[PDB]
Amino acid sequence: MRILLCSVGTSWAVVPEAMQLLGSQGFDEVHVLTTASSKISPGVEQLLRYFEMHPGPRFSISRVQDFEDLRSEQDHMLFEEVLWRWLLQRAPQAAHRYICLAGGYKTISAAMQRAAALFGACEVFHVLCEPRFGPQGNREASTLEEVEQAIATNALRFVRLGPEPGWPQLRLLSAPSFPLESTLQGPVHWVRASDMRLRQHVEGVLERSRHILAAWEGISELPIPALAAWPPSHLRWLHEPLDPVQDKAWVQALPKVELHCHLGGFATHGELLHKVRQEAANPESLPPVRAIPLPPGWPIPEEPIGLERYMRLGDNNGSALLKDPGCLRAQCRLLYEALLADHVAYAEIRCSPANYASASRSPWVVLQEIRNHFQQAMEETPEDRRCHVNLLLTATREEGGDRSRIARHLALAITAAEHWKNGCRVVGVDLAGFMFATDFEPVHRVGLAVTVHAGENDDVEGIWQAVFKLSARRLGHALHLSRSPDLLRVVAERGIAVELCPYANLQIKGFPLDEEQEGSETYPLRGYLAAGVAVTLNTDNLGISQASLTDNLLLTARLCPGITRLEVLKTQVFAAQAAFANQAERKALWARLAQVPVPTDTE
Amino acid sequence: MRILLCSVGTSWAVVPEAMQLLGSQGFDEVHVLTTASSKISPGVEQLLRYFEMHPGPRFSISRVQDFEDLRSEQDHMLFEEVLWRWLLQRAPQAAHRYICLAGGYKTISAAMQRAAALFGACEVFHVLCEPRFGPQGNREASTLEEVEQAIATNALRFVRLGPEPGWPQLRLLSAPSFPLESTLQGPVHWVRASDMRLRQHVEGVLERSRHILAAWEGISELPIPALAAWPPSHLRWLHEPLDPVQDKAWVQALPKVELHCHLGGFATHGELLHKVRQEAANPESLPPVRAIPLPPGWPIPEEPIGLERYMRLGDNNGSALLKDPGCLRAQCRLLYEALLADHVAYAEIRCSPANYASASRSPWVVLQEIRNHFQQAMEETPEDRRCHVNLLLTATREEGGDRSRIARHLALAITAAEHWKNGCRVVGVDLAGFEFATDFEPVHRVGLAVTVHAGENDDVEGIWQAVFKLSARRLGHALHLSRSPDLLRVVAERGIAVELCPYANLQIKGFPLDEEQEGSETYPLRGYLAAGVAVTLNTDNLGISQASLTDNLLLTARLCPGITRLEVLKTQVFAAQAAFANQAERKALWARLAQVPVPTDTEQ
Ligand SMILES: Nc1ncnc2c1ncn2[C@@H]1O[C@H](COP(=O)(O)OP(=O)(O)OP(=O)(O)O)[C@@H](O)[C@H]1O
Ligand SMILES: Nc1ncnc2c1ncn2[C@@H]1O[C@H](COP(=O)(O)OP(=O)(O)OP(=O)(O)O)[C@@H](O)[C@H]1O
Ligand SMILES: [Zn+2]
């Protein structure tokens, strides 16, 4: 197939002359674009007579109804829109497209050239006639007899500009997406453009292509590969230090990943605690609301309060309340609502079903109820904003105490790992208080991921036994990793993720704030990132800490001077990579992460 | 700063009319480019006279010496080549670039528009003059007085096309890189260009940009990000099954990574063995050459010969030959030469220095000699072709033999890990036994990576012990992972690399070859790849197996039906990520891997 597109102005001989570009072979069909000027109607009638006298290929003449003459840039813009739509309609395939640029204004020929360059064309050529005609024998063909004699005498020279490859993302557009209206006035069509959707789309695609090519060199330094389409100014903004007050909206709109979120520390105080209590199935058995005065300056304490006091601050919830089915359901639904409000795309909630068991409610029943509450919450949310939740069972070694709870939690995890295979799942266990792995072989045998929850001890020996004796894949609260260079190198090389909770660490350990340089007591985020460690920022306890994931992300701007927004994105990508999700969950999380919000202050 | 660029044809009045685009402000710099036709000269004197008055802006007129008419498209190409250089020299900055396409040929205005699009400019506009001038008041202004009247009567209409950013790869181009030969003839510069390098550069840049845009969609499925610049036909070629016979040249040129290579099994026979023996320091203690007949059909045996016979095949080299300093030096140099010939960019060599020690040569001396030979060989190679070599110490359990060597090798590795920090290094220890949990705590405490060299058995329990008790980061010859589903899932999730040797596994174990479809006994390479396991292809014993890394990669096509060359690239990337390298070595390896050879038979 071969389709020829030609533009005509005051001279009608351009079409018959360009029809002889291929010689005796001819064109399978020639299409002519025309303006609305009345000065060209005799040209149109002569072209129609020529076409009738030369039957064969399909003929169609298109006139721009709204373009009578070139008076301003608006007329040229409308002509460009109409020409693009007409080329799409009459030339669906760029390999079958032949374009002639003899006729039209000096801008119209450039319009055809640009259209061929963008949307592609098999060949773009210019038809010329040797001046030997007229009464003086110096003009070119102008009448039917003159055009016929010019074609016969071979007074025509064609300038073949060569095929135009076009662009990959503009070579796939189709006419039905952007239709064109044509009013037939005799054998010539009168076309018009209803709107400029096609041109706006083309301009946006070209701008996106320019953005992609500009940042193409150096794309491996970007966390999200889809982030390379950002404008260079926005990337420069991304490479700047985070502002805790200016970037609140951007951090809030970010799709985040949660990995350290204790379920029993969500509704410890405030209105959420009363909302949970009012949902109790047996309201008479609710324990009295004791007085738990928060330290002054919460959530930013003046001085560190210690792990024991931090634990004691959450005595109004947990095993006291969640032994009631109604309180447990309310806690689960409120936690899911809080996760949705913070734009979290993947969360791993760690719970202790054994603590919540009753005489008639075994730990298995409690775990099943928690899983079903989370699954029902997930299934009631649209997939475009659904936060996938997985469960970690918390086995804790307490001072003295009984070892039955640890065994029960391990067995419950080892059972739930195979019971559920879709939706909310038990993805692993975390070992809090354990350096002693003799009963942890079965969890490794069944493929359960293990994360070790580091405690008050600032012992490098604990982070060693977690890595090489507990076979931990994530370390929680590993703030003293830099004290042993060998351990830091091992953690970086083996890809063990270090999950950090800014507010919890500040309230328990305490770190300098709003510094200008990196000190000896400074928060170890930037040091870990510079060493190649996979660092993740989490919330720990939403209720006790009284800070969401966005607040934790923003607080790094104060804890670590010079923290950049790209490093926040790096932490999010590290959390996504370190999650215990499967293939489908990981691909869904990656799809969610690609939708990075656009900045609001340019650069 | 505002520079105006205009073309001039038969009508010189276009430049003065375009001079009033901004109004009274004018242009701080205006340049005129035209052809060498004699008809352009009177327009030249008219423009010079017009520049005599209104002397505000800077003036210059350029004429293409070799371009006069539109009678040759090659003239058009030369005109474009001179045009781009003239625009770069006269309009170095696109932001300060104001281009007018009123004058000149239609192709001249097209060149104006194309140059503005490619290189960028602040504004492209067309100037229109009312015909209410000249005799009869029916022609556009063409004289000094007529032009001034048109300017002073608001008779000029301007069509500002709008700002054009230009492509990123063409905006940073500089005039000095593409000089223009200008000769002064009065107030006009006669410009000429010696080479068409600018046009070729532009064409290559646009072609590469088109390829990158086409491949942008599938950017996460490409193991090497540099493959996005490949043409779409080549990318489609990359996704077809590997052909062992027609893809040998492409595989031979690939920058490969070696993770499983034994030093003592490189020159077990052939002319390499004779060269190593000739290089002996004392040619009287050399053991007599033992007659070891290779199994028929080598390197592709008719039937698998087992591990014991495969080990015995290399009895002419190793412990009973490498105790000679000259033999050891020749061994190391020949191994490095073989590595270079295969285009290997990173290699990890496994050696047993204790087995090569004598009364006057302690294991440390042997290890230091091996390291220094490899480092010296590396330093004599250019950095662009240099193959970085690291060392792995093999601690092999014996069948109730010696136990002192298993400790001496570990101590030697722990010492060498701290001794050397640049060039060749000892990066880990190889465990060829227990596949001992109390013997490797010191290894882990110093940051040494351990690779478990499984073999001569099919037991998932050994793999479990290696992964969880030995803390192995790589597994060798783990061909039975699929038999245990939990083990396969754990290996996939923990990012443990599996070192597969095609020729060695085929010779020892035996697998079906050239089978049309996969089966129960098929090679587990593609099954491992589909499960998310990081698989690597190595050589094991270069000498005993009698096959190079390229041979192994090609034979993987026969072992695994319908394997694509993109899978080969994926295996190379997996080997690069699984190497026990540091930041500098890893970045150098990544830089080397980015130079994927271009395919040659992408025509079907
Ligand atoms: N930041 C922390 N540091 C140390 N231990 C913690 C921390 N947060 C929670 N824990 C411990 O985790 C254990 C189990 O966590 P979970 O979130 O399931 O709490 P819980 O069962 O509701 O707690 P409780 O009933 O003791 O208040 C609890 O015993 C708590 O002591
Ligand atoms: N393909 C293999 N499969 C299993 N074990 C192997 C393999 N190749 C080598 N080994 C083990 O590695 C040890 C060292 O092999 P290497 O190639 O370095 O030669 P070597 O030091 O001369 O060996 P040897 O002690 O047999 O003389 C061998 O003794 C054997 O224990
Ligand atoms: Zn081996």
- The H or E element that residue B570 is part of is helix B565-578
Strand order in the sheet with A426-432: A256-262, A344-351, A388-396, A426-432, A449-453, A474-476, A497-500, A534-537
Q: CB of B473 within 8 Å of any CB in chain A?
A: yes
Feature table: binding site of A for ATP: 262, 264-265, 311, 319, 352, 355-356, 396-397, 453, 540-541
Contact across the interface for A165 and B490, Cβ inside 8 Å: no
Nearest by CB to residue B444, choosing from A107, A468, A583, is: A468
From residue B286, alpha-carbon distances to A307, B230, B276, B332 in Å are 70, 54, 11, 18
- 3-state DSSP call for residue B495? coil
Give B319-359 as a DSSP string.
TTTTTSHHHHHHHHHHHHHHHHHTTEEEEEEEE-GGGG--S
Give the residue from B569, B511, B486 showing the smallest Cα distance to B256: B569
For B392, phi then psi, to 5°, come to -120, 135
| Cβ contact, residue pair A447, B493, below 8 Å | yes
Q: In whole angstroms, what is the distance from residue A322 CA to residue A329 CA? A: 8
* B517, two tokens: 């479809």
Residue pair A18/A50 in contact (Cβ under 8 Å)? The answer is no
Ligand 1 atom, smallest distance to A396 CA: 13
Helix axes B485-494, B460-468, angle to 10 degrees: 30
DSSP structure class, residue A99: E
Provide the residue type at B19 as one letter: M
3-state SS, A429-497, equals EEEECCCCCCCCHHHHHCCCEEEEECCCCCCHHHHHHHHHCCCCCEEECCCCCCCCHHHHHHHHHHCCE
Q: List the 523-552 stretch of B: residues with Cβ below 8 A of A.
A: 532
Report how far residue A69's alpha carbon sits from residue A78's, in angstroms, rounded to the nearest whole number. 11
Where are the strands (E) in B208-255, listed by range? none
Per DSSP bridges, beta strands A344-351 and A256-262 are parallel
Residue with tokens 């109820």: A369
**Nearest-angstrom CA–CA distance, B176 and B89:** 8
**Residue where the block lists tokens 């520390």:** A265
Say whether B374 sits in a helix, a strand or coil.
Answer: helix
Q: Do B445 and A168 touch (CB under 8 A)?
A: no
- Determine the residue of chain A that is closest to B159 in CA distance: A73
**Cβ distance of B212 and A214 shorter than 8 Å:** no
Q: Report how far residue A421's alpha carbon sits from residue A441's, in angstroms, rounded to the nearest whole number.
A: 22
Q: Would you say A99 and A123 are in contact if contact means Cβ atoms under 8 Å apart?
A: yes
Q: For A349, phi and psi rounded to 5 degrees?
A: -90, 125
Count Cβ–Cβ pairs < 8 Å, chain A vs chain B: 86
Q: How many residues does chain B have?
A: 604
Q: What is the dihedral of CA B425, B426, B430, B436, to 10 degrees?
A: -160
Contact A600, A249 (CB under 8 A): yes
For A8, the token pair is 């005509």
In 10 A of CB B597, how many CB atoms?
A: 13
In terms of Cα–Cα distance, which of A420, A446, A418, A427 is closest to A348?
Answer: A427
- Structural method: cryo-EM
Joined tokens for residue A174: 């189709």
Chain A CB within 8 Å of residue B410 CB: no
Structure tokens at B141: 């202004």
Nearest bound ligand to the CA of residue B394: 2
> What are the φ and ψ backbone dihedral angles of B244, each rounded to 5 degrees?
-60, -25
- State the best of A112, A199, A216, A441 to mutate against chain B, taking most chain B CBs within 10 Å: A216
Tokens representing residue B450 in the block: 């351990």
Task: Write out B98-133 in H/E/C secondary structure.
Answer: EEECCCCCHHHHHHHHHHHHHHCEEEEEEEEECCEE
**Residue B108, both tokens:** 């001249």
Residue among B165, B214, B471 whose CB faces A168 most closely: B214
* Sequence ranges of the binding site of A for Mg(2+): 262, 264, 314
* Paired sense of beta strands B388-395 and B426-431, if any: parallel
Query: What gap in Å lies between CA B218 and CA B232, rounded to an integer?
Result: 11
DSSP bridge partners of B476: B453, B499
Pocket test for ligand 2, best of B352, B434, B509 (most atoms within 8 A of CB): B352
Helix, strand, coil shares of chain A, percent, nearest 5, are: 45, 15, 40
Rounded Cα gap, residues B91 and A49, in angstroms: 50
- Cα dihedral: B136, B139, B144, B148 (round 10): 90
Longest Cα pair distance anywhere in chain B, in angstroms? 118
Paired tokens of B528: 């491992």
Task: Return the number of other C-beta atoms located less than 10 Å from residue A376's C-beta.
Answer: 15
Question: How do A449-453 and A97-100 pair as beta strands?
Answer: unpaired
> Of A68, A104, A100, whose CA–CA distance to A87 is shortest?
A100
Question: Alpha-carbon distance A440 to B98, whole Å?
Answer: 74
Q: Distances from the Cα of A584 to the Cαs of A416, A590, B138, B379, B583, in angstroms?
A: 19, 10, 75, 48, 32
A352 lines ligand 1 (CB under 6 A): yes
- Provide the β-strand partners of residue B465: none
Of B167, B213, B468, the CB nearest to A168: B213
Kind of pairing between the strands at A123-129 and A97-100? parallel
Partner-chain contact A212 B214, CB within 8 Å: no
For residues A444 and B245, what is the distance between their CA atoms, to the nearest angstrom? 45
Q: Which two tokens stand for residue A66?
A: 């709204």
Here the tokens at position B562 are 């319908």
Contacts for A84 with CB less than 8 Å, ≥ 6 apart: A115, A119, A198, A199, A202
- Structure tokens belonging to residue B280: 């002996």
Alpha helices for A428-484 (secondary structure H): 441-445, 460-468
What is the dihedral angle through the alpha carbons of A113, A115, A121, A127, rounded to the nearest 10 degrees? -30
**Relative to the alpha carbon of A395, which ligand is closest?**
1
